[PDB]
Amino acid sequence: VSMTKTSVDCTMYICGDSTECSNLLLQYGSFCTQLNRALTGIAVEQDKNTQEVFAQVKQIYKTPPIKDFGGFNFSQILPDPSKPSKRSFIEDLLFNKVTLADAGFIKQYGDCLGDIAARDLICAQKFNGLTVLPPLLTDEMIAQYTSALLAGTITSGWTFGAGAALQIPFAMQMAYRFNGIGVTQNVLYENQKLIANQFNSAIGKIQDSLSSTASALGKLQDVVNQNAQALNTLVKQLSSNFGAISSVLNDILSRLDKVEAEVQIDRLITGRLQSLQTYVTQQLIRAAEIRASANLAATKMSECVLGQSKRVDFCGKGYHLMSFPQSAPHGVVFLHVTYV
Amino acid sequence: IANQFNSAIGKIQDSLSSTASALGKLQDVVNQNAQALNTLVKQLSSNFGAISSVLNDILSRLDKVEAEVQIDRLITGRLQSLQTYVTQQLIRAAEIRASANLAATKMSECVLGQSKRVDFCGKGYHLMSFPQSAPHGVVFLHVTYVPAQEKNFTTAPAICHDGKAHFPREGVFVSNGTDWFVTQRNFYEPQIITTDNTFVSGNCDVVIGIVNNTVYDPLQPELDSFKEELDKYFKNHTSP
Amino acid sequence: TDNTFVSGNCDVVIGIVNNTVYDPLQPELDSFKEELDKYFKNHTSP
Amino acid sequence: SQSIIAYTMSLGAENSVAYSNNSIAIPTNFTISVTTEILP
Ligand SMILES: *[C@@H]1O[C@H](CO)[C@@H](O[C@@H]2O[C@H](CO)[C@@H](O[C@H]3O[C@H](CO)[C@@H](O)[C@H](O)[C@@H]3O)[C@H](O)[C@H]2NC(C)=O)[C@H](O)[C@H]1NC(C)=O
Ligand SMILES: *[C@@H]1O[C@H](CO)[C@@H](O[C@@H]2O[C@H](CO)[C@@H](O[C@H]3O[C@H](CO)[C@@H](O)[C@H](O)[C@@H]3O)[C@H](O)[C@H]2NC(C)=O)[C@H](O)[C@H]1NC(C)=O
Ligand SMILES: *[C@@H]1O[C@H](CO)[C@@H](O[C@@H]2O[C@H](CO)[C@@H](O[C@H]3O[C@H](CO)[C@@H](O)[C@H](O)[C@@H]3O)[C@H](O)[C@H]2NC(C)=O)[C@H](O)[C@H]1NC(C)=O
Ligand SMILES: *[C@@H]1O[C@H](CO)[C@@H](O[C@@H]2O[C@H](CO)[C@@H](O[C@H]3O[C@H](CO)[C@@H](O)[C@H](O)[C@@H]3O)[C@H](O)[C@H]2NC(C)=O)[C@H](O)[C@H]1NC(C)=O
Ligand SMILES: *[C@@H]1O[C@H](CO)[C@@H](O[C@@H]2O[C@H](CO)[C@@H](O[C@H]3O[C@H](CO)[C@@H](O)[C@H](O)[C@@H]3O)[C@H](O)[C@H]2NC(C)=O)[C@H](O)[C@H]1NC(C)=O
Ligand SMILES: *[C@@H]1O[C@H](CO[C@@H]2O[C@@H](C)[C@@H](O)[C@@H](O)[C@@H]2O)[C@@H](O[C@@H]2O[C@H](CO)[C@@H](O)[C@H](O)[C@H]2NC(C)=O)[C@H](O)[C@H]1NC(C)=O
Ligand SMILES: *[C@@H]1O[C@H](CO)[C@@H](O)[C@H](O)[C@H]1NC(C)=O
Ligand SMILES: *[C@@H]1O[C@H](CO)[C@@H](O)[C@H](O)[C@H]1NC(C)=O
Ligand SMILES: *[C@@H]1O[C@H](CO)[C@@H](O)[C@H](O)[C@H]1NC(C)=O
Ligand SMILES: *[C@@H]1O[C@H](CO)[C@@H](O)[C@H](O)[C@H]1NC(C)=O
């Protein structure tokens, strides 16, 4: 649904506190503002992508105190009241299963210097002018929007999508579903205890699958890994000579006088300018893959969660009954329920 | 329905006349096109380390053997400025294509049709949509049915009348608290529960939450009214 | 006749099969004929 | 008396929908809504 926001300031990346270099970098004109402006365009689009996927209700629905859903057991996908973050059991699995780089939540020297400065990459990225901004919506606010869509789905069916939420008993909602897939509603009511046991058992396999297998969240970990590998590659390009006598502007300025320091520095400015434009082009292209994924995820939220879909194999494999959204780090997970 | 629609179009007419914050998606495209060209024109001012931003000054001051070194800096920085503009435009143009293919999909599914897709053709249940042109874009006026004034009702998944269980053919069973009816799912038009409104399957022991009420047979008053005719004829024909 | 609808003669449909179609109004009218005959049979006596 | 305030954003109006195992809400009336969607 999104990727890590980043701002990279052209000045501390290229010139790294050298005012001497800064007076050369101005000779390349508006390239710095184009980079800053670009990355700001990507960073605002991450909040928009998250807003369009999750904020599909203007009302925060909540579940009734009595869980009488006709024998269906949503307790594993609904919020847990006992937890300090209002995640469901399946969301707390999904949140452990992705290993992040920089949430943006206040990095403040004591964590940055000394013992941790060896193993941690994220502090060194910050020291070189690369910064990761936090999302507009916390993982608590995504968990609340996901709760509203799920509590709306189990209490109200599709009606909370089309207008105000209208209560219906859950076995009568599930009958309107069966009728949608061309199965007559008495096939639910005559088999309801079996249909609930099949659903409750199937939700149990999601618990076990997510607890067991390492490959499940590959579509999300490969976003976090591309963010981290591109940032590491951009930090590593500060090591490059570009044909100058040193990788470090302070060395060149220690050794040389202005007349030829300008020639050694011009090379480092050039290549560094080229290293940022490469990263920002790669990030603009990636951001278009993530926006194409977010617009699909918003379309699936609208058509599989707020509704029921006639579209074959769109809302999982089978004939679609309903779907439950779940939050994940930088993503969304749909539990599609299908009649097979 | 016509007065609600005529008033709703009247609010589009007023809204578009009133508020500046509406066509922001289109003005953003014109602004990004204008900004990118202004930035590419401003890059002609940049020295790139040459003695001047202006190519004729270098050709005024210097002879070819070193004018070419000053020129090669400007060629390099300018050529990098074009590739930056053209990459930005190639990327942006893919966003406008994605927007156009969505607009073509909405033209096909919302204007040339009616969509069962929830929230694809405006907020509500989709009835129809009207396209309107705009500078570099399209506006769709989506027309939607939205359910408005609700009442609560008691309901049941089935009715029991003769140990046989009954389900609606279409719609849902509702009760005002004293009597029972079928209504269509999305609008309250209650009807007497009959063998035309409902279908039978199995007996009342399997359906959780089934309720007792009579189910009317509309053929029975015909055969009853003809039984009264039959008796009055037989009673008369005791006399001849 | 409530599970099915009628259109055309059997000569046009490729692969059509013969079977009875039940009319649920017919046993109502048949039971109404047995009721009519028991009334007329009793009516021989007065 | 105007100033810049800062606040945690409200996601929407909080709403406990009145679910019960035998209760249904049905609309007795409707509004035709016309809504504008804008695309490049
Ligand atoms: C909905 O399904 C839930 C998951 O199966 C179920 O919760 C589970 O219920 C069992 C039986 O009560 C618990 O088993 C444990 O019970 C206590 C817990 O302190 C232990 O002392 C026992 O040794 C035993 O391990 C599960 O732990 C419990 N799982 C969770 C995640 O809570 C619900 O009860 C079902 N809901 C309804 C309404 O039936
Ligand atoms: C539940 O819905 C029922 C059907 O609309 C409704 O019953 C109907 O109530 C009206 C009065 O409000 C009756 O109207 C008759 O009243 C007397 C009867 O002797 C006559 O003088 C009048 O001319 C008129 O015919 C309806 O006859 C009656 N229908 C039936 C089938 O009994 C209930 O009142 C509703 N209950 C609630 C709680 O809203
Ligand atoms: C819905 O209507 C049903 C028909 O009126 C009714 O079923 C009847 O329920 C009673 C009580 O369970 C049974 O009464 C008999 O119970 C035992 C023998 O089974 C005896 O001890 C009693 O003396 C008495 O004979 C009826 O036999 C039963 N009738 C049928 C045809 O099943 C339901 O109880 C009603 N339910 C509700 C909630 O209204
Ligand atoms: C399906 O049921 C049909 C009605 O019972 C049946 O039609 C009958 O078919 C036979 C053979 O074609 C006809 O028999 C007559 O054929 C000629 C005259 O047409 C004579 O030489 C024979 O002696 C005999 O009279 C029936 O007349 C015909 N009935 C009707 C109403 O058309 C189909 O054959 C059955 N098909 C199958 C596969 O079961
Ligand atoms: C269904 O909802 C309709 C609104 O969406 C509602 O229409 C409104 O009806 C009232 C009267 O009940 C009208 O009020 C005006 O009526 C006349 C003038 O026409 C005056 O005497 C009144 O003082 C008042 O000005 C509303 O103008 C009308 N609104 C619209 C948009 O037509 C229906 O009444 C509702 N229908 C049902 C069956 O509940
Ligand atoms: C639909 O019903 C809900 C709740 O159930 C009703 O509660 C009583 C008021 C009574 O009508 C019972 O027979 C029903 O079972 C209604 O929700 C209440 O709304 C009012 C404000 O209008 C609020 O003060 C109460 O706290 C709400 N109660 C609960 C439990 O949430 C709702 O108003 C009914 N809708 C309509 C259109 O009548
Ligand atoms: C509905 O809930 C009540 C308690 O409020 C319970 O007694 C009843 O058995 C339930 N009925 C059904 C059909 O689930
Ligand atoms: C009674 O039967 C006679 C014929 O036998 C007929 O003329 C008369 O109209 C009948 N009246 C009624 C009320 O059926
Ligand atoms: C079906 O195939 C059989 C041969 O297996 C053939 O005799 C028959 O005519 C075919 N029937 C139809 C309705 O096509
Ligand atoms: C026969 O007719 C008489 C009235 O003439 C009636 O009392 C009796 O019950 C009838 N019996 C039958 C079997 O119809």
Numbering used by the authors:
A (entry chain A): 729 to 1068
B (entry chain C): 923 to 1162
C (entry chain A): 1117 to 1162
D (entry chain C): 689 to 728
Could you give the paper's own sentences about this structure?
A third variant, Kappa (lineage B.1.617.1), also first reported in India, remains a variant of interest (VOI) but had only a limited surge. Although the Kappa protein eluted in one major peak corresponding to the prefusion trimer, there was a considerable amount of aggregate on the leading side and a large shoulder on the trailing side, suggesting that the protein is also conformationally heterogeneous. 3D classification gave three distinct classes each for both the Delta and Kappa trimers, representing one closed prefusion conformation and two one-RBD-up conformations, respectively. For the Delta and Kappa variants, the FPPR and 630 loop configurations are largely consistent with the distribution in the G614 trimer; all are structured in the RBD-down conformation, whereas only one FPPR and 630-loop pair is ordered in the one-RBD-up conformations. There are only two mutations (E154K and Q218H) in the Kappa NTD. Glu154 forms a salt bridge with Arg102 in the G614 trimer; E154K substitution results in an unfavorable interaction with Arg102, possibly leading to a disordered 173 to 187 loop nearby in the Kappa trimer. Residue 218 is surface-exposed and on the opposite side from the neutralizing epitopes. Q218H may contribute to rearrangement of the 210 to 217 and 173 to 187 loops. There are two RBD mutations (L452R and E484Q) in Kappa, which do not alter the overall structure of the domain. The E484Q substitution loses the salt bridge, but hydrogen bonds between Gln484 and ACE2 Lys31 might compensate and thus account for a small increase in ACE2 binding affinity.
